[PDB]
Each structure stands twice: as C-alpha cells, then as structure tokens.
Design a protein around this ligand. Structure first.
Ligand SMILES: *[C@@H]1O[C@H](CO)[C@@H](O[C@@H]2O[C@H](CO)[C@@H](O)[C@H](O)[C@H]2NC(C)=O)[C@H](O)[C@H]1NC(C)=O
Ligand SMILES: *[C@@H]1O[C@H](CO)[C@@H](O[C@@H]2O[C@H](CO)[C@@H](O)[C@H](O)[C@H]2NC(C)=O)[C@H](O)[C@H]1NC(C)=O
Ligand SMILES: *[C@@H]1O[C@H](CO)[C@@H](O[C@@H]2O[C@H](CO)[C@@H](O)[C@H](O)[C@H]2NC(C)=O)[C@H](O)[C@H]1NC(C)=O
Ligand SMILES: *[C@@H]1O[C@H](CO)[C@@H](O[C@@H]2O[C@H](CO)[C@@H](O)[C@H](O)[C@H]2NC(C)=O)[C@H](O)[C@H]1NC(C)=O
Ligand SMILES: *[C@@H]1O[C@H](CO)[C@@H](O[C@@H]2O[C@H](CO)[C@@H](O)[C@H](O)[C@H]2NC(C)=O)[C@H](O)[C@H]1NC(C)=O
Ligand SMILES: *[C@@H]1O[C@H](CO)[C@@H](O[C@@H]2O[C@H](CO)[C@@H](O)[C@H](O)[C@H]2NC(C)=O)[C@H](O)[C@H]1NC(C)=O
Ligand code: NAG
Ligand code: NAG
Ligand code: NAG
Ligand code: NAG
Ligand code: NAG
Ligand code: NAG
Ligand code: NAG
Ligand code: NAG
Ligand code: NAG
Ligand code: NAG
Ligand code: NAG
Ligand code: NAG
Lengths: 483, 483, 483
C-alpha cells in the first residue's frame, strides 16, 4: 500500500519568464499587459467626442465655409481630428496662441454659440456685405468665415468703429477677431479709406493695439496679403471693447463656454461609435483593468501605463511538467494525494492546502493590479515649430516614464514569477513533511514524494493520513513485524 | 521533562499588509509614511521666509501703498503669500514677465533697497509731485507706488528725459519701471505735452522701444487707461539708460540683490513661527527622516516623496498570534525556549538568534530609509492663463512621479512584509533543527515545536541544549532504557 | 571513511551589500555601474561631431570673422562647444530664437552653404562694400560677418530694396538676416538716407515688419547701436521675400539642410578623437552595456541611466568565507564534495549542480542588464535668463528621474544580493540532503555538512554516492555490524 504527494498538471502550453529561467511552462497564468483594443473611438465619462471630419479646430471655431455641414455639440470630452483635416484657416495668416486655444477647447462642460454683434444692427456705418474672398469659397462663390465679419468702407468712408460687449453670461465667453494686412497701400485704401489705420482691442486683463503691416507677400491660396487671428476669453461681468479705424475683422458669433478640467486632441482616422470607455487610444478604446498596455504612448483617460514590453505574463500556477513530475489526472486541485491499496486507487486534491494557495496567489495578483490606481490624464501635447525645446522636454518626460515603467514592469513580472513557482514547490514539500510527521516509522520513503506503508492501510486510513488524524501507535506493532 | 522552541507575542493590534495576505498582525513594525506636520511655517536652511501678509509679490516689489507697513528682510529662503493677498498692482495693467520675476525672487542671499534715482536731484526738469492716482489711495489720499515716480509735464513742457545708472555694486540690480497708457489723446497731452511720445530703455543685453497705446478701456479700479510694468536685471559693471519724451514711470528705488539657487512660493494662511525645518509644506512643516509623505504634493526642501497611499507599515517583527502559536510570556526576546522539569519551568530568550535577527532587520529598515537620499527642490511652479500647455506639462511630471512613487512604495512594503515574516519563521525553524541535531535519539518530537526527553534533563542540561553543547552520548544509555 | 558537502572559496576581497547585511565578501560578482570613460569625444552613429573650437553657434552660423578658419562638415551628429567659445555675435544685439536654432542645428543629415543672394548681382542699387565695423575686426581691419551683407546708401540714395529667393532645393533652407538700429538719427541718415525706414520679411508661414529703434545705448564692443538677428526656415517650393527701405542686413549665404531627428550640444574642453561610441558624455565617451552610470547626468545617445550611487555590485557567487566554511582547494566549481578513505582523498566539484547554478545566475545577471533597453536621447537642454521657469521644470524632470533610478537601482542590487547568497546556500543544503537520502542508515551525520560511513567506501562507492546511484542494501549488513 502506498500514498504519494504530488501536484497538478495539464495540457497548457503558455509560459512565463522568471529572472532565473526563461520559457517556464505553467498550469495557470494571467496577463498584466493589454495588447488589444476594440478598434473604435468611444465616449469618456459618458460624453461624446467632438468629431471634426474635414475641418481642424481653427476651421471649426472660425467657421470655415466647409464646416457649415458640421453639427456642433453642446459639450464634449475630447476632440477628434482626422489625418486629412486640412480645412483650417482659409485666409492665410497666423492664428495667434493657436496651440493654447486648441488645448483650452479640448474639454468643455458646455458650449453655446451666440450672435455677439448682430450683423444687421451692430455695424450701421460699415459695409458688412463685401467681406468676401476667393480664398474662402462656398459652392464656387466668394465667401468668408461664418463667425466673422470683414467690414469694408461704406460710401468711401470708414468712420471710427466703436462697439463693446458686456458678458452677462455666468460663463466665460470666447471672442475671436482678426486683423487684415493688405498686400499694397492701394488695397488698404480700397478697403478702408484711412490708410493709416489702427485697431485696438481690450478687456480688464487684456489690451493690445495693432497696426496694418502692408507689404507684398508670396501668394498663399491666391492671396498676396494676410489675415491674423486673435482671441481672448472674457470673464463673467467683464467687457470687451473693439475700437478701430480699419483692418478689423469683427466677431459675429462668440462662444459661451465652460472649460472642463482638461483633456486632449486625438488625431485618427478611426470612426466614432456609440460605446463607452475609460481610456481612449488613437488606435481604438482600451477596455481593461490591467496596469499596463503596449498599444500606444498617447492616451486620454484613466489609462494603463504604456510599456514597450510585449509580454507580461504573471504566473499563478505551478510548473506544468508531465517528485518526478505532475499528475495530469489530478484535475480537482493544485496539490493533492494519490493512493493505492487492495481496495482501490486514484487521486484526490488536498482542498485545504490548495484553497489556501489559491487565495494567497489570487490576492497577490490583485495586489499588483489594484495598486496601480491611475489618474485621468490627456498625455498628448502639441507644440509649434518655434517650440522645439519644450516639445523635446515633453518627449524626455514620456521617454523617461516609458523606460521606468517598462524596466520595472518587466522586472516585476520576473521577480514575481520565480518565487511563485518556488512557493508552490514549498507547499508541496510541506505536504510531504506533514505526512512524514504522522507516519514516522509506519512507512518508508521510496522516492518520488511517495511513502510505502509497513501495514495494511484501508480507505479509512488513507483518509486519516490526509486529514492529519493518523494514529501512529495503532499500526506500530504491525510495522515492527514487517521490518 | 520537555524543551520547546517558540516565539514572542504581545498585545499589539496594528497590522501590515503583505502581497499575499492582508491585515497581518505583527508584534513590531515601523512607519515609512509621514502623515503629520507641526502646523507651522518654519525656517529653511536657518533662514526665515518673507511673509507678505496682505500684499502679493508685485505689490511688494513695486511698493503698493498698503505694503508700507511691511518690514522687508535682508534675505529669505522662500516667499509666503496668503490666500487673500490681493494688494498687487494698484494701477491696472500688465506686469511683464511677472511669473519669471516671482520665481527669481523666490530665494535671495541678500536684498537691499536703495534710491537709484534720488527724487530731489534726478528729475529737475519734470514734475515728480503730481504722479498720483485714485487707483492707489493711501489713507484716502491720492497716491502712488512707493518705489516708482510718475513724472508729469512741468510748465506745459516735457523736455527729453535722459538718465542712467551704473551698477557699482558687486551684485545684480533689479530695476523696475512702467509705461503709462492714457485713455485719450487729451490725457496724453494733459500729462506729457508731446502727444507722440516714446520711451526707450536699455542695458548691454536689453533694448526696447515703447510707444503709448492710447485707447479707451473698460474701467478697472476707476481707470480707463493702463500702466504696464517692466523690469530687468543689471549685471555688475553695466549701465541702464532711460530715455523718454513722456509716458515713462521712472524707478525711484531699485534692489541690489543676489539670487540664491532657487526655491518657491507658498500660498497659505498658515502662520510663520520661529522654528526650523528641512521640508516646508503649505499645510505646515514636516519633521521626519522617512522616505515618503502623504501630506501634500507641493513642498520646498529636502522633502520625502509624495505618495497618495495612506499606509506604509513595514514589518520588523514576527506575526503576533496568541508551533501552535506565540508565547506572550517570553518578553525578553523574539525567539527562545520554554522548559519544564522537576526543578522548575519558564521562558528564556535565545539571545544570539534574537540579536542576530534584530540587527539584520534593523539594518534592513535603515536601508529602505537611508537610500532615498532626497535633494533640495521647490516642486511648485506658476504659469499664467496663456501658458496652459506648459502648466499641464508640469502636471504630467508631478502626476507621473506620483504614480511611480505610489506604486513602487506600496509594492515595496508588500514585497518586504511578506518575507520579513517568512524570515522570522525560518529562524524559528532553524532553532528547532539546531536542538533536534543535538538531541538525536535522546528525545522525541511531540508536535508544537517541542521535544520530550527520554532522560532526566536538569537545569544544567537544559542550558547545555540551548547553548549548543549538549552531550548526546552521556544520556544515550538512559534513553535506551526508557524505549 | 568520510564524504563532505561544501562550497568554493578563494582570495577575493571585494564585497556586495545586501538589504540585511553590509560588506558581504563574495567569491564572484559583477558591476552594474559604469564609472569610467575613455576621456575622448567620439562619433555617434558613425558620424563626427561639429567642433567649434573658438566660435559658438551664433558665430559659426553668421560667419564671425574668427570662424573663417573653421572647416564646416557636410553633416554632424552633435555639436561641441568649448568652455571659452566666446566668438558669437560680434555686432551686439539680440539673436532671436537663438536657443531654438541651437537645438534645430544640433543634428543634421546634410548641410550645404550656398550663395543665396550673389554679392555682385543681387544688390546693384546699394553699396555692399561699406558694410564694415570696428566691432567685427579681421586681422585688425574693419570687417563684418561673412554670411551677411550690410548694405549702405549709394550716391546718397537708398531705393526700395526688393529681392526674393525661391527654394528649388529638395531640402529646407535656413536664411538669416539682421536689422540695424543706429544710435542716433544722424547715423540713420548717414547710412540709409530715408530716416523713416522699415524692413519687411516673409514666407508662406512667416510675416513680420520691423522698424528701426533709434536710441543711444551703453557701449558694447564700442557700439552705441545694436544689430538684431533673425532667421527662418524656408520649406521646399516656398519663397522668401525681402522688402526694405533701409536697416536691412541681407543674407549673402544660406544653408540648405536637413534636420536629423534631434540631438544636443556638449560644452567641453575634451578633444575630439577618431573613435566610435553609442553614448557621449561631456567628460568623455562611455563604452559599456551596463544599465547604469555615475559619470554625468547629461549625455547624448543610447546611454545608461544616471544614478548618484557609487557602487552597484551584483553578486553572482557565494559568500567567500575561508558547514563551517568554504574550501579554497575546490577550484573546479562552486559546489562539490570532499572525500577521504584508505585509498586517497581530495576535492571534486559537483558539475551538474554547479553548472545549473551558473546558468541560472548568469541568466539572472543578463536579465537585469538586458531589460534596461535604453533609447537614443539628447538629455541636455538650454534656456535663457527669461526662461527660468521652464529651465527649472527641466531640472525637476532630471532630478526626479535621478532619484527614482538611484533609489530603485540601489535597492535592486540590495534585493538581489541577499537572495543570491541564500540561493547558493539552498543548493548546497540540497546536495547535503541528496546524499543523506541515499546513505540513510549506512552513514552518520557528524556536523560540518559531513557524513561518516559505517562501512568501507572505496573510490567506486564515493563516485556512486556523488552520481546518485548509491546502493543502500549492498552495504546495509556491514553498517549493522558496526553499530
Ligand atoms: C478645404 O480643403 C480642401 C482640401 O482638402 C481645399 O481644396 C484644395 O485647394 C487648393 C488651393 O486652391 C488646390 O490646389 C487643391 O487641389 C484643392 N484640393 C481638393 C481636393 O480640391 C479647399 O479649398 C478648402 N476650402 C476652404 C474654404 O478652406
Ligand atoms: C455610457 O454610460 C452612461 C452613464 O454614465 C449611460 O447612460 C445611461 O443610459 C441609460 C439607458 O441605457 C439611462 O436609463 C440612464 O439614465 C443613463 N444614465 C445617466 C447618468 O444619464 C450610457 O447609456 C452608456 N453608453 C453606452 C453605449 O453604454
Ligand atoms: C488693497 O486691497 C483691498 C482689498 O483687499 C482694496 O480694497 C477694495 O477696493 C475695491 C475697489 O475700490 C472695492 O470694490 C472693494 O470693496 C475694496 N475691499 C475692501 C475690503 O475694502 C484696496 O483698494 C487695495 N489698495 C491698493 C492700494 O491696492
Ligand atoms: C535653526 O538653526 C540655526 C543653525 O543653522 C540656529 O542658529 C544658532 O542659534 C544659536 C542660539 O540658540 C547660536 O548660538 C548659534 O551661533 C546659531 N548658529 C549659527 C550658524 O548662526 C537657530 O537657532 C535654529 N532655530 C531654531 C528655532 O531652533
Ligand atoms: C573673438 O573673441 C575674442 C576673445 O576670445 C575677442 O577679443 C577680446 O575683445 C575685447 C573687446 O575689444 C577685449 O577687451 C579683450 O581683451 C579681447 N580678448 C583677447 C584675448 O584678445 C575678439 O574681439 C572677438 N572677435 C570677434 C570678431 O568677435
Ligand atoms: C565607426 O563605425 C563605422 C560603421 O558605422 C565604421 O565605418 C566602416 O569603416 C570600414 C573601414 O575600417 C569600411 O570598410 C566600412 O565600409 C565602413 N562602414 C560603413 C557603413 O561605411 C568606422 O570605421 C568606425 N570608426 C572607428 C574609429 O572604428
Ligand atoms: C486541452 O486544453 C484545452 C484548453 O485549455 C482544454 O479545454 C482541454 O480539456 C484540454 N485537454 C485535455 C485532455 O486536458
Ligand atoms: C526560449 O528561450 C530562448 C533562449 O534560450 C529564447 O531565445 C526564445 O525566444 C524562447 N522562446 C519562445 C518565444 O518560444
Ligand atoms: C469590457 O467592457 C464591458 C462593458 O463596459 C465590461 O462589462 C467588461 O468587464 C470589460 N472588460 C474588461 C476586461 O474589463
Ligand atoms: C478531520 O479532522 C477533524 C479534526 O481536526 C475532525 O473533526 C474531522 O471529523 C476529520 N475528518 C474526517 C473525515 O474524519
Ligand atoms: C498592552 O500594550 C501596551 C502598549 O504597547 C503596553 O504598554 C502594555 O504593557 C501591554 N499590556 C500587556 C499585559 O502586555
Ligand atoms: C481587512 O481585510 C479586508 C479584506 O478581506 C479589507 O477590506 C479591510 O479593509 C481590512 N481591514 C481593516 C482596515 O481593518
Ligand atoms: C523633530 O525635530 C527635532 C528638533 O529639530 C529633532 O530633534 C527630532 O529628531 C525631529 N523628529 C524626527 C522624527 O525627526
Ligand atoms: C557555551 O558554549 C561555549 C563554547 O562555544 C562555552 O565557552 C561557554 O562556556 C558555554 N556556556 C555555558 C553557560 O556553559
Ligand atoms: C589571488 O587572487 C588573484 C586575482 O584573482 C589570483 O590570480 C591568484 O591566483 C589568487 N591566489 C591564490 C593562491 O588563489
Ligand atoms: C563596512 O560596514 C560599515 C558599517 O558597519 C560601513 O560604515 C563601512 O563603510 C563598510 N565598509 C567599507 C567601505 O569598507
Ligand atoms: C569597448 O569598445 C570596443 C570597440 O567598439 C568593444 O569591442 C568592447 O566590447 C567595448 N567594451 C565594452 C565593455 O562594451
Ligand atoms: C551516473 O548515473 C547514470 C544514470 O542516471 C549512469 O548512466 C552513469 O553511467 C553513472 N555514472 C557513472 C560514472 O557510473
């Protein structure tokens, strides 16, 4: 009659690496690294993105003629631009603090367009119907930005323009305007009469005077002149004043909006779908609770940390090795016993030891995952061609964090997997000793983690040994007789 | 007669977490996380902060009428502003490179105010007594900044102003001035006569021409005009030249100062007290050598790393479990023996093993703490409303470091605590074996980590076993007789 | 007859630290920290640096008279400036976006100088031979920048200047020019006639008007006036237009170049040598595959992480302690046996166990090193005196990463070294047990990890025990007789 202590085995072919040994096949493991996405752009915090299918942000906020088709949302959690979103400014010039605006508009709680300076009543002394150009065509017709009015001299006169808006909203108002810069003096006079024109704009924390910069420039979109764009936020209760003798492109519409924390802009040709996520990647939303991902470095949301590793498999089970080896027949648990006597034979798991190991290892896996506790962040940032130093500083931060997370994540798995297997080996060894301590002189050790009895051990005996209730004295005399 | 190997126990109710098991009660532990402060703002490097109780930095450096009460320090290690420090610029306008100045003044080795352009001798052709406004009242009277002079036309004439200062100090000089921008032409003429006025200021590495920007603006502090503020540092040996035909607010006082490395600004209503610290937090100074703190993300000094964890308890002792369990009576050490014979009974610690474990664990704790080796840094940074991209870059850095430190700190405690307990278990087991190896056949194992002798073992025997000097052969014959 | 299980020892005197115990002497260890360099500046990616021995970048790109001796490379991987590279701008003024230019030129795939506006044909109406100054002397003669032409009125007339360049290159063109600012009106007229002069420059994404700012300034290099420098890149297919009535210093030469990713600038007096490296440090190139270095925080290339630790020794071997202690005579392996009988005595390594431990530990060391997987980065960044906030942000990033890497690197070695020694102890103990399991009752344990036989064990017996093929029953009767 024999009783053996062994461990579980199966047909599992996946592996883990350990710091000491590579390609260790295990019976069970979990994945800490998410390498998949659903291929769709989803809502964040239950709120849809603003999708600019053809237009970029400058185009959309200014009212490029091609953005008219776009339905504006009252709110959004992030902005999506496509790889071919070319419809930005249609009248060539510099959009000032464009990048800062792009970021401020990245996430809004609310957004309403309203007509700040009504076309039919605000500009009675100026011609608001000649403000068109071939650079901003609509269905082949000369046109202009929808949210701006380009005023032209009326009756060969451009009287001082003096208008203001008082922000009676409970929210900040975004006001945009522009300055026109004719290619020649002749154009300056044709449009504004005054020649030596100036523009002044200001609010309680903003004040700037502008002058026309008249020179011939290389043609862009068939324009030898330029039009710059400016913007400011007006605090609730404040006033914005526009004073000009020419070259001012006045706001028509302005936006009442409340900035929501902050998010980012995703550039992707990936479609928007009615789905929910907590982590939005340019390649598609990520749906996981795992601490790491290797899909993309730039994500918006409470995202897993980006690592450049390809495989972070955390062992939970023991080595799968078909004690000489494991028992593929012991399907009911990790550790257990096999017995053979004159009544019968077979396998049975040691439920106390097995469940103990399961609870401790499961909690261990949960510790690694639960402690990541990520924060909601935009990650991606945008800089212009004269901001390379800061762009590269941002890169240092992303590369530094990547190397830290990759190094620590890859080692952590390697530090954990080695012991996990030693832990299981220890538990198996401990079962062997627990039996040895009971059998004492009533059985001999025969190798392979097995004991051979010096007495007949029936089913009620094998159970006594497994349950830790074996009566040594009871079988002592028989054992003496057989030695 | 018996001899048992056991371990210490007490009435301690605190716990540690391990990566495998939560809420493990231990006999001894240490705290790696500082969650308290003394509630006071203290000196850094033995040097007091500059406390601006009512004024902010712009107010203080310009000489806002309400800062007159403030006693200026000759030096400071950091600057403290209160939550209601509203007295900044009193004459509305833009303070240029204000944020850069705020940071440069954050820490100074020395700071002296001196009268760079004496009021009674530097401006003989201009009226220095009319430079007042209702926007900067003093005790109800019209007044102005104390460190600046606003010059007005004298006798309906504003002759070219031409003054310079040569820096004969061994330290850099901070010179501040401003440009006035009247709301109307009529005011420009009332104050400066010339109408088409200009201002020029320059040093060896600085040169800028300014022109009045005259337009009506929204009233701020009852002013329809604005006054901008500018500043520059003058290197030792250099000269600063002020040339103007109007609209120049000239320096009266300038500051000779030496910038000390760099620190930061704390915004807090917490009072300044005569105390010392090496880490200043907005909520109160931190007094600890521990590697982590969870008090606040923004601190100045050689501060513990901020983590968002709440509990980093590092086990030093063994499991406190009242071998079946621990011995609450073994008060003299972690590991030890209990004996009982016909002479007496009781507990005694194994001093060699216990001290060994103490030295190794104590050194281990010190390793975790000592290796943090922090640096002196300001941490907090300030950006304006047109600098959101860089402000958010700074945020990424702080959030990234927080997640890294929190994740690693929480795991480190969990990686350490699990083994610390296994280490103690190993030492206890080793004592059991050391005894087993001596007693051999002269005693039997009876469970609970205890041996039962087959011979009479007197006090001089029990000591021989504990001391590793047990004479097996000596008691062999008696043991044979009793088997 | 005896057989002992022991371990290797030698005369090695180096140590490792462990988290539990300091100064542990080991038989073998490796260094993870590189603290040496070859003292020379080497090529990166097979490409030489651009070495500016006397000139700085502004000097070199503008053509300071002292840079004429310098041979320009067609390409470079990084730029080297010396500690005394004072020859920058020779005509005092502000070089605009200088820092951004310095970084863009840090690494170029190709770089060709060409004469964008030929001196003899582009400026027929202006005097190109009077553009000299005492501020930019050459061999004692008045001179000027080599890549720029300072045009002066010809025949007391300065007719409108109108020239343009079309970029017919497949690469970006860097065009530099400057604006002159005379100290007095009299000089403005002496040089340009027009007095109220202006300069306009523009490209498809750039447009700026400049005006002379005429005022007397402190003398720098005997100049009471100033000359500012501007630059822009012209995209392939675009045009740059220069329109002026005076005060324009026109480009003579321009550079056709392609920016290569990005690198940095090293300031060092260390010479350039014909050698190769993958990591360039200001103190000399680093030649190692190790994960960490403590040479310098600022490096260019696929560099080891900078740590401020001094010693990262990773144990590979076992404790070197001349089982009571190690065997200095067992030179053929880490673990092994010693035997003595009537035939002979001596040592022999256990090759199976020793090689197993070597392969696992060697792979372990390689795991720590191989997983660092660094990226190519410049690390160093440059900011001006009005950019302290961003400079200090960059510092936070470097200090934060340093503390993270130092803390983790120092602990990692301490976490690893402790167990490495326990691992070896476990393997030695396991050999002891493997022997014990065979000998059973045919030998006694005598301490020191040794067994003493109860029978005569010849050379063919000692080999049977070591090889795991000992026949217990064979010697059982003799063992009985001797007990
Ligand atoms: C909107 O974007 C399209 C491009 O997506 C612009 O059309 C291009 O205009 C340039 C200049 O006339 C032509 O050289 C290209 O061949 C046109 N491309 C296509 C596909 O038609 C269009 O002009 C933009 N409209 C506005 C108002 O900005
Ligand atoms: C995304 O999450 C939001 C909750 O934040 C879901 O909104 C709920 O939708 C159900 C209808 O299915 C309504 O009865 C609930 O009242 C809504 N909750 C709130 C707070 O408004 C939304 O449906 C989810 N979207 C998807 C695609 O699953
Ligand atoms: C100093 O700060 C106080 C506020 O702390 C200023 O007083 C306020 O002035 C505004 C404008 O006149 C009033 O609407 C507020 O009601 C005043 N508040 C209080 C509490 O009096 C004061 O004018 C500032 N003085 C200077 C020189 O800047
Ligand atoms: C803060 O630390 C400084 C030392 O950096 C203490 O200054 C010393 O004060 C004693 C009087 O108690 C003098 O006798 C010493 O000469 C001072 N040392 C130096 C270098 O000047 C200071 O007292 C400490 N402050 C507090 C509140 O403890
Ligand atoms: C090139 O750099 C040298 C310094 O390395 C300049 O020479 C200095 O010029 C100043 C001003 O005339 C003198 O006060 C110094 O004494 C000179 N130093 C030396 C060592 O001669 C030189 O003028 C620069 N040349 C150019 C074209 O920039
Ligand atoms: C630095 O590395 C480059 C390769 O990137 C070496 O260039 C080779 O030099 C040999 C002559 O010794 C030529 O036969 C090969 O054709 C070159 N390879 C290439 C791709 O051009 C260079 O010699 C190395 N420099 C040093 C000092 O070792
Ligand atoms: C082989 O592996 C698969 C997947 O785990 C499992 O469903 C199947 O039952 C295994 N076959 C055997 C004989 O265990
Ligand atoms: C197996 O181990 C070897 C190293 O001996 C390694 O190169 C290989 O990639 C591992 N196997 C896989 C991915 O199957
Ligand atoms: C995938 O998304 C669904 C719906 O929100 C969620 O129930 C499921 O748990 C997510 N999968 C994972 C791995 O989190
Ligand atoms: C196992 O042992 C426990 C005592 O610890 C006893 O109560 C239980 O009945 C035993 N199980 C069996 C099947 O006898
Ligand atoms: C209970 O715990 C306290 C605090 O450690 C200690 O002072 C006291 O002596 C303990 N009581 C007993 C009976 O051990
Ligand atoms: C005890 O463990 C449970 C998990 O089983 C955990 O939720 C709880 O917070 C722990 N206890 C405390 C703080 O007392
Ligand atoms: C608290 O401050 C005092 C005085 O400087 C110092 O002696 C004490 O050690 C500090 N406490 C800690 C935990 O460092
Ligand atoms: C303990 O053993 C040492 C020898 O290692 C001996 O010198 C010492 O006297 C012994 N202690 C007692 C109390 O006998
Ligand atoms: C002493 O150490 C050196 C360096 O490792 C070695 O070459 C030499 O053989 C050693 N001497 C002895 C006797 O082992
Ligand atoms: C040896 O250990 C001590 C601590 O007990 C430490 O101070 C010393 O620096 C270590 N030794 C060296 C560098 O030899
Ligand atoms: C030093 O450089 C040489 C030549 O490139 C290389 O063969 C050698 O392996 C390098 N040394 C180290 C430690 O990498
Ligand atoms: C060692 O044992 C193996 C069997 O595992 C056997 O084949 C080999 O011949 C033995 N070595 C010697 C020297 O007998």
């Amino acid at each position: 009659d024999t009783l053996c202590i062994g461990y579980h085995a199966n047909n599992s072919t996946d592996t883990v690496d350990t710091v000491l040994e590579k390609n260790v096949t295990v019976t069970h493991s979990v994945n800490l690294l998410e390498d998949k996405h659903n291929g769709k752009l989803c809502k964040l915090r239950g709120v849809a993105p603003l999708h600019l299918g053809k237009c970029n942000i400058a185009g959309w906020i200014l009212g490029n003629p091609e953005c008219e088709s776009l339905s504006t949302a009252s709110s959004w959690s992030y902005i999506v631009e496509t790889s071919n979103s070319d419809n930005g400014t249609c009248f060539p010039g510099d959009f000032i603090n464009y990048e800062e605006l792009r970021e401020q508009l990245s996430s809004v709680s609310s957004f309403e367009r309203f007509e700040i300076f009504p076309k039919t009543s605000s500009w009675p002394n100026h011609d608001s119907n000649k403000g068109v150009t071939a650079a901003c065509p609509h269905a082949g017709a000369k046109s202009f930005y929808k949210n701006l009015i380009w005023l032209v001299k009326k009756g060969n006169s451009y009287p001082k323009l003096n208008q203001s808006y008082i922000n009676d909203k409970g929210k900040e108002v975004l006001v945009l305007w522009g300055i026109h810069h004719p290619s020649t003096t002749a154009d300056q006079q044709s449009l504004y009469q005054n020649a030596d024109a100036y523009v002044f704009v200001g609010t309680s924390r903003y004040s700037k005077k502008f002058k026309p910069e008249i020179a011939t420039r290389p043609k862009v979109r068939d324009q030898e002149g330029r039009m710059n764009y400016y913007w400011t936020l007006v605090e609730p209760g404040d006033k914005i004043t526009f004073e000009a003798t020419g070259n001012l492109v006045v706001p028509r519409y302005a936006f009442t909006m409340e900035r929501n924390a902050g998010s980012g802009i995703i550039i992707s040709d990936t479609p928007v779908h009615d789905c929910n996520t907590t982590c939005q990647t340019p390649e598609g939303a990520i749906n996981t609770s795992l601490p790491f991902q290797n899909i993309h470095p730039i994500t918006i949301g409470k995202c897993p940390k980006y690592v450049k590793s390809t495989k972070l498999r955390l062992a939970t089970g023991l080595r799968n090795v078909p004690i000489e080896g494991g028992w593929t027949g012991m399907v009911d648990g990790w550790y257990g016993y096999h017995h053979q006597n004159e009544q019968g034979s077979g396998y049975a798991a040691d439920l106390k030891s097995t469940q103990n190991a399961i609870d401790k290892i499961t909690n261990k896996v949960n510790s690694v995952i639960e402690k990541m506790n990520t924060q909601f962040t935009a990650v991606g940032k945008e800089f212009n061609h004269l901001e390379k130093r800061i762009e590269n500083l941002n890169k240092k931060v992303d590369d530094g964090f990547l190397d830290i997370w990759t190094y620590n994540a890859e080692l952590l798995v390697l530090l954990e997997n080695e012991r996990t297997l030693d832990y299981h080996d220890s538990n198996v060894k401990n079962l062997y000793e627990k039996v040895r301590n009971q059998l004492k002189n009533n059985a001999k050790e025969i190798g392979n983690g097995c004991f051979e009895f010096y007495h007949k051990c029936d089913n009620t005996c094998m159970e006594s040994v497994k349950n830790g209730t074996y009566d040594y004295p009871k079988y002592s005399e028989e054992a003496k007789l057989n030695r």
